[PDB]
Amino acid sequence: LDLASLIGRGQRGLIVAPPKAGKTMLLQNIAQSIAYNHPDCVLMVLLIDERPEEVTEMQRLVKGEVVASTFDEPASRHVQVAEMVIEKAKRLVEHKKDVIILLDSITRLARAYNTVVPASGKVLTGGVDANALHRPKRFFGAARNVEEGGSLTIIATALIDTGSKMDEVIYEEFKGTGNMELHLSRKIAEKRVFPAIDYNRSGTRKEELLTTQEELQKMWILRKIIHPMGEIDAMEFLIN
C-alpha cells in the first residue's frame, strides 16, 4: 500500500495492466496510501484522455491537486500539459521539496506524441517516429532522484493488449528501460521474467556448452520471506 513500500523514494517505476483489470480504484488506493502514510510529500495525480466522470471522481476522492485532461480535447492539450507539469515538477525540485506523481497513462502520452510529432522520416514498423520515442525518453528520465536534498518519485501506468499494435512496441522499449514494473495479467509476467526471446536464442543452440561458471551463473532462488500478509514468496534471478 505505502509508496515507500512499493516505489520507495527517488526511483522510478511502472505498473502495467490490460483493459478491464482494475486500474482506477488501484490508483485511488495508492493515492490515499500516499496521503495518510506520507502526508509530507506533495501529492500529484495526473490523467490523460479519459472519461470526465472519472477525472472528477479522482479529483474529488483525493486531497492533492489533480491536473487532468479529459478525452474531449485534442492531443495538443495533452502534450502541453505534459511539458507544464514536468516544468512545475522541476520548479518544485528547485523548491527543495519531495513530490509524487500518479500519471495515467504513459502509453496514452506516448502515442499522443506519436500522432502529434512532426514527421521526420525516422519512422519504424507501425509508423513510430524516433522523436516520439526520445521525447518520452526525456520525460521519463527527468524522473531521476534528487541527490542534493529531498527525493522526487513517480508511479507510472501503462495499458497492454488493447487490441492494437502501437502499444506493445512502446511497452517493450519500456521493458528495455524499466526500473520496476508491476504486472497484473497472466502471460506478460512469464514474458518478462522468462524472456521468450532469450529462451529461443538459447534453444537455437540447444543446451549451449557454457564452460565452467558460465553454466552455474544462471540461478533461481525462491525464499518464502515473512510478509504481513503471511509467507509471501520472493523469486530472484541470480546471475554471477
In the complex, minimum distance from the CB of residue 53 to its own copies, in angstroms, rounded to a whole number = 4
Q: Smaller CB distance to its own copies: residue 57 or 64?
A: 57
Site for ligand AGS in 25-84 (CB under 6 A): 25
Binding partner at 233 among Mg ion, its own copies, ligand AGS, none, C-beta below 5 to 8 Å by kind: its own copies
Q: Least CB distance from residue 23 to Mg ion, whole Å?
A: 5
Q: How far is the CB of 16 from Mg ion (least distance, A)?
A: 15
Is residue 70 involved in binding Mg ion (CB under 5 A)?
Answer: no
- Give the separation between CA 185 and CA 99, rounded to whole angstroms: 29
- Dihedrals phi, psi of 153, to nearest 5 degrees: -155, 150
* Minimum CB distance to Mg ion smaller for 24 or for 131: 24
Among 24, 37, 59, 151, binds Mg ion (CB under 5 A): 24
Backbone angles phi, psi at 119, to 5 degrees: -65, 135
**CA atoms of 109 and 233, how far apart (whole Å):** 35
Answer whether 154's CB lies under 8 Å from 103's CB.
Answer: yes
In angstroms, the CA 192 to CA 93 distance is: 33
Whether 51 has a binding-site annotation, put simply, is: yes
For position 21 contacting ligand AGS by CB under 6 A, the verdict is yes
13 labelled ligand-binding: yes
Residue 159: strand pairing partners = 17
Helix or strand or coil: residue 46? strand
Q: Site residues (CB under 8 A) for its own copies? A: 12, 19-20, 50-53, 55-56, 70-76, 80, 83-84, 87-88, 91, 115-116, 118-119, 121-122, 124-125, 127, 130-131, 134, 137-138, 141-142, 144-145, 162-164, 172, 175-177, 179, 203, 225, 228-230, 233
**Which residue type does 159 have?**
L
Cβ pair 188, 175 in contact under 8 A = no
Confirm or deny that 77 is annotated as ligand binding.
Answer: no
Q: Check the annotation: does 21 bind a ligand.
A: yes
Strand order in the sheet with 181-183: 66-70, 42-50, 99-104, 153-159, 14-17, 181-183
The dihedral sign for the CA sequence 126, 80, 32, 43: positive
- Binding site members for ATP: 8-13, 20-25, 51
Sites of contact with ligand AGS (CB under 6 A):
17, 19-25, 194-195
Sites of contact with Mg ion (CB under 5 A):
24
